[PDB]
Amino acid sequence: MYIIIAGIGRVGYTLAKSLSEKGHDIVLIDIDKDICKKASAEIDALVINGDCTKIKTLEDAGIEDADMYIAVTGKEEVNLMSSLLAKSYGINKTIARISEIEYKDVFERLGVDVVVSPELIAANYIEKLIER
Amino acid sequence: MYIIIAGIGRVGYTLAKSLSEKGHDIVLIDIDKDICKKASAEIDALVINGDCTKIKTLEDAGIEDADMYIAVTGKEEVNLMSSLLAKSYGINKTIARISEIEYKDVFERLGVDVVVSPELIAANYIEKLIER
Amino acid sequence: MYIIIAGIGRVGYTLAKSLSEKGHDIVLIDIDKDICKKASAEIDALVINGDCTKIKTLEDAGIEDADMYIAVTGKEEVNLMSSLLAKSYGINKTIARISEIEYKDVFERLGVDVVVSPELIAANYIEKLIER
Amino acid sequence: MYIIIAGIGRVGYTLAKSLSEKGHDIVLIDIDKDICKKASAEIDALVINGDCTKIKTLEDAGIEDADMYIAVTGKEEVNLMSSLLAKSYGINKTIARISEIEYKDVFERLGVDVVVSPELIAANYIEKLIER
Amino acid sequence: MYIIIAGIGRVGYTLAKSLSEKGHDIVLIDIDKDICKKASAEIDALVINGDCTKIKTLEDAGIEDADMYIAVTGKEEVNLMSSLLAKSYGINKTIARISEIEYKDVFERLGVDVVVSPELIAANYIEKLIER
Amino acid sequence: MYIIIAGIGRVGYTLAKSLSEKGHDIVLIDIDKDICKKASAEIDALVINGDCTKIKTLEDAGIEDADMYIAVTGKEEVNLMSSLLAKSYGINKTIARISEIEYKDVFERLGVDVVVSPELIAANYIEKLIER
Amino acid sequence: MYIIIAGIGRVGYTLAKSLSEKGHDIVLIDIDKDICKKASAEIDALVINGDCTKIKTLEDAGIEDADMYIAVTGKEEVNLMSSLLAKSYGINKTIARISEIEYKDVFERLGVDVVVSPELIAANYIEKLIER
Amino acid sequence: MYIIIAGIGRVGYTLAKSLSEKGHDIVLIDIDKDICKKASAEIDALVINGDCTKIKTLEDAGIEDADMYIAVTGKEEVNLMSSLLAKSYGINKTIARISEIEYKDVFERLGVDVVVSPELIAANYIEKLIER
Ligand SMILES: NC(=O)c1ccc[n+]([C@@H]2O[C@H](COP(=O)([O-])OP(=O)(O)OC[C@H]3O[C@@H](n4cnc5c(N)ncnc54)[C@H](O)[C@@H]3O)[C@@H](O)[C@H]2O)c1
Ligand SMILES: NC(=O)c1ccc[n+]([C@@H]2O[C@H](COP(=O)([O-])OP(=O)(O)OC[C@H]3O[C@@H](n4cnc5c(N)ncnc54)[C@H](O)[C@@H]3O)[C@@H](O)[C@H]2O)c1
Ligand SMILES: NC(=O)c1ccc[n+]([C@@H]2O[C@H](COP(=O)([O-])OP(=O)(O)OC[C@H]3O[C@@H](n4cnc5c(N)ncnc54)[C@H](O)[C@@H]3O)[C@@H](O)[C@H]2O)c1
Ligand SMILES: NC(=O)c1ccc[n+]([C@@H]2O[C@H](COP(=O)([O-])OP(=O)(O)OC[C@H]3O[C@@H](n4cnc5c(N)ncnc54)[C@H](O)[C@@H]3O)[C@@H](O)[C@H]2O)c1
Ligand SMILES: NC(=O)c1ccc[n+]([C@@H]2O[C@H](COP(=O)([O-])OP(=O)(O)OC[C@H]3O[C@@H](n4cnc5c(N)ncnc54)[C@H](O)[C@@H]3O)[C@@H](O)[C@H]2O)c1
Ligand SMILES: NC(=O)c1ccc[n+]([C@@H]2O[C@H](COP(=O)([O-])OP(=O)(O)OC[C@H]3O[C@@H](n4cnc5c(N)ncnc54)[C@H](O)[C@@H]3O)[C@@H](O)[C@H]2O)c1
Ligand SMILES: NC(=O)c1ccc[n+]([C@@H]2O[C@H](COP(=O)([O-])OP(=O)(O)OC[C@H]3O[C@@H](n4cnc5c(N)ncnc54)[C@H](O)[C@@H]3O)[C@@H](O)[C@H]2O)c1
Ligand SMILES: NC(=O)c1ccc[n+]([C@@H]2O[C@H](COP(=O)([O-])OP(=O)(O)OC[C@H]3O[C@@H](n4cnc5c(N)ncnc54)[C@H](O)[C@@H]3O)[C@@H](O)[C@H]2O)c1
């Protein structure tokens, strides 16, 4: 019924802020206590302090009632493991970020719905501009 | 064929020694250089200092030709991802070590051939002795 | 006529539930209240909240007439000290978990009847799956 | 009529190859020798091995008649400085990668034509997939 | 006819007080509230609490008619950016603190009037005491 | 008969390079192995890898035959302790760097010959310029 | 008068408890917040979370009014510097803990009232028992 | 008719030299060759290089007829295990060093004749200097 975002960093925070304002029900997960404080004070969404690879953390995030799980942590193994765990919990759309461009197609096959490579994206973006 | 072992700690080191003494061809992967030095000074096996979650590490380890991949790091997140990365290269016999009992099932359902919980193995072991 | 088990974590919990369910009469010990509460809610057994290295706690657990003492705490010397304490009370069957495999024979030499290393046992287990 | 690109990593390499293949005259700059060897071997183009914040390196890259300067190093300030340098030589088309979103308009205010934050772009690319 | 100084820490505070006492019109800028309270209470001068990389903050500091801009923040790039901003407003006298000696002439090349590396100055001050 | 420099950082390295060239017999001390490698390859002087607060490190540095000991580590307690130990070993001129401007006169009284505050120095420096 | 104790580890915590039970007025300093929480929840004393080498920490601790300053951190470098900083404020009875036997003398000759080596105290203690 | 001492570090070395010099007949044990070499060069005594937790090492040291066993190794359970091993051989006087003060009474309850905590003893010592 809602969306969970793991990794409230440069990618996560911005996405959360933007989604929170667009009128979406979001829940944020971050292993850093101080980051959860900031986010909870600056964003209208529920915040959970903990490791998103842990089942209990996901349960606390309401993993069972989400139709979307986005893992944008700075560690692709956390995003990978997180996403696959979420998938096995019924969630229909999972989005995982990678730091290894060469993992995009690998993560997809393994089951991740959408694999985001900020680097690869930034590149195409720059290329599209030159092509205009 | 070749057997790759990631994580030269209590589990990996023991397994490494035991397997090599039996004639097996093994290659060890560890992110800690000192344990890599120690290892290469005592075991009959190829030792690589690297992150087992990275493409270059697994490839330099002969992952494209290995017959077995065993991830016994102290971080289930690394064991899971790297094993799935090994599977991606064609290795069916992937063995990953987990920290949380719960994943015993999930992880195997997640794509890894065998999931090993030393804590569970220990309990069962104690149980058998008692039932004797 | 009953088994005393200290350390109801990854190893103790599972072992205790398993023994309990098989009709075994068991008494449990854990220094952590939350773990004790969890064990009282899921396992039919006497549950003592205390430090297994303190004689009073062992008294409360019936150390005086138990047929066996099992120390599977996460701390190596706690498991050894408490087992030695159990031994001083007459207990002829002690099982103690260990972290550093190198001391296995010392624990045994000192009277611990069965020394269990989850890591060593897990390495042997994996080794058996390889030999088929 | 060529294009200079500094920083041939996750973003740089991808962009260089994509553009190079699409028939584009390009000169590459990297302070890392082994990265240069790899790019010059897989990408048809001129490769300079130097610090892009050093005028000599820029002169050698032909900054004098370059039509566009692209700094996609992992060091935000290196990208900014080299870009302002490209600017001082008459280059009216600059693209600079940043790490701290907050400085985006500061960069644009100082004259950087296109400011690209991979993190920020990944964020709204993800948000766009949720508005589809 | 005043002087703006950004970053009122170990370098800033000392300079501000020294100059202020020596009868100098000065405006201070710090993003840290408690540092502002302390400086405005011990130094006679205007104190703005904002990010010196933000135009609003500069406008409020009166960058329009300042005769000199001094950025001595602990963040090298903040000092550079704010200084180039001061430059874009017509300030022909800029002083910027740096952390990486290597970029000294890069800073001077981009127009920063005086580049001060506390570390570099301590080094030759020490060397001068050995040539005495 | 010679000079010892502890802390081969922005301050130490530069001072060492400059002193080495001026024809001085210098010995460098640094707790970082990789920093000792660089320095030893780039500078004509003997390098010792170790903690300069330790007697053995100072002995290895030839503390007994030095007429000067300069501690420019990033930790004022290391410089303080280092300098006082050197003094007690006969050395005539000791130079210690501080990170707390308020310690300049304190360190002097305690016995340090010269206490250097790169920050305080950078400030006066900037002030002297404005006064010209 | 007041007794300040820096380093709430095995030595400091025990000393803290023992001294307060005897009616003494004590204040504890520790850089670790959790040990500060634990301490403040069990001891009759003022607890400060801070670096004992910093002016503000010692002043907030009442160093200008204390009668005794005891530095029992696990880093002799910190115990020495802070004690000398205490001496600087007028405190004659400074007690610092050292790690290396050697400094037993040097440190007292270095300015601290009493130098304590628990390792040496332990040896002597064992010696007396044997000579009985 | 002689004292066996294991662990010739900060505590063992000093104690051994002191006992030796007073005419005591002592045999020393240390797992570190360099420490043994150091002890053979400075202390008149038999020096055995080995692991005091291994019976063979204790045999080599004459554990069979020593009047006392002193374990002042830096490892708490090594000191306890070896002392218990010494006890099993008839030795009626064992002294063992400990790290965690909380277990002092357990070691004693288990038969270690004298338990020594350098930290507790040092706290008592300082406490005595305060009471004058
Ligand atoms: N420019 C900068 O200021 C800056 C600052 C910090 C890090 N970085 C870089 O940012 C890159 C990625 O940045 P990003 O936007 O994704 O944010 P980030 O790397 O800064 O942070 C990732 C975030 O996810 C959180 N998290 C939640 N659950 C986690 C879990 N189970 N394991 C680990 N982290 C968990 C982390 O605590 C953190 O807040 C990194 O490679 C790093 O080098 C840059
Ligand atoms: N009681 C104790 O003394 C004790 C001591 C150490 C660790 N532990 C615990 O027990 C377990 C120790 O298990 P173990 O000894 O077999 O393993 P380990 O935890 O000691 O080590 C994991 C190993 O894998 C290595 N490795 C290789 N590639 C890696 C990668 N990409 N990422 C991370 N690590 C990588 C690590 O460097 C390390 O040697 C852990 O879960 C830990 O919590 C307990
Ligand atoms: N990687 C992980 O997520 C993870 C998570 C939890 C625990 N661990 C590790 O598990 C290993 C041991 O696991 P385990 O099976 O024993 O479970 P555990 O580590 O989770 O817990 C040990 C248990 O023994 C209990 N206990 C009872 N009496 C005790 C006493 N006197 N002193 C200390 N503890 C006492 C503890 O309170 C606790 O329930 C450790 O190395 C620990 O770091 C790892
Ligand atoms: N998780 C990971 O394994 C991982 C690995 C590597 C890098 N990273 C992160 O990724 C970020 C960006 O990575 P990326 O691949 O796009 O770039 P990068 O940060 O990895 O590398 C910058 C590149 O630009 C080159 N370069 C050319 N001129 C330079 C100059 N003057 N100064 C510095 N570099 C110069 C460097 O040699 C290098 O190839 C990094 O800042 C780091 O936080 C993460
Ligand atoms: N050893 C230590 O205890 C210690 C303590 C503090 C700082 N430091 C070091 O000292 C270095 C420099 O210290 P310093 O006192 O001269 O300066 P600083 O780095 O400590 O502080 C920078 C100052 O500029 C202010 N400021 C104003 N506008 C700002 C902006 N837009 N962005 C950021 N800061 C802004 C900050 O609020 C702050 O007071 C630091 O980078 C750090 O490495 C060391
Ligand atoms: N701008 C930068 O790149 C940069 C890089 C690193 C650190 N810093 C900052 O630099 C400031 C001081 O810089 P610096 O020029 O003195 O160099 P530094 O702080 O970078 O390094 C101090 C040096 O002394 C060495 N050393 C030798 N003996 C030591 C001992 N016993 N204990 C600790 N270190 C010992 C350290 O290993 C290191 O090489 C710090 O406060 C830090 O915030 C800045
Ligand atoms: N065998 C073991 O289990 C074991 C365990 C921990 C530590 N150790 C060793 O034994 C000794 C422990 O002594 P202890 O328990 O009395 O002290 P400690 O080493 O445990 O702690 C020193 C204390 O002082 C605190 N502190 C306060 N201000 C500080 C500052 N400015 N800088 C640094 N620390 C500051 C630290 O946070 C810490 O609590 C150490 O030398 C260590 O090497 C051994
Ligand atoms: N802060 C420091 O500089 C420092 C320096 C050295 C040692 N230490 C600390 O000292 C504490 C213990 O000191 P200590 O007086 O025992 O001296 P120590 O720590 O220097 O050495 C312990 C000694 O016992 C020896 N030993 C003999 N048999 C052994 C066995 N079976 N297993 C292990 N060691 C055996 C070791 O080889 C060594 O000589 C530790 O917590 C250690 O970290 C601290």
Swiss-Prot record, chains A, B, C, D, E, F, G, H:
One of its GO terms (molecular function) is potassium ion transmembrane transporter activity. The keyword NAD applies. GO terms for cellular component: plasma membrane. Keywords: Ion transport, NAD, Potassium, Potassium transport, Transport. NAD(+) binds at residues 7-11, 30, 51, 73-74, 97. The keyword Transport applies. Residues 1-116 form the RCK N-terminal domain. It comes from the Archaea. Homotetramer. Dimer of dimers. The RCK N-terminal domain binds NAD and possibly other effectors. This is expected to cause a conformation change that regulates potassium transport. Part of a potassium transport system. This is Trk system potassium uptake protein TrkA homolog.
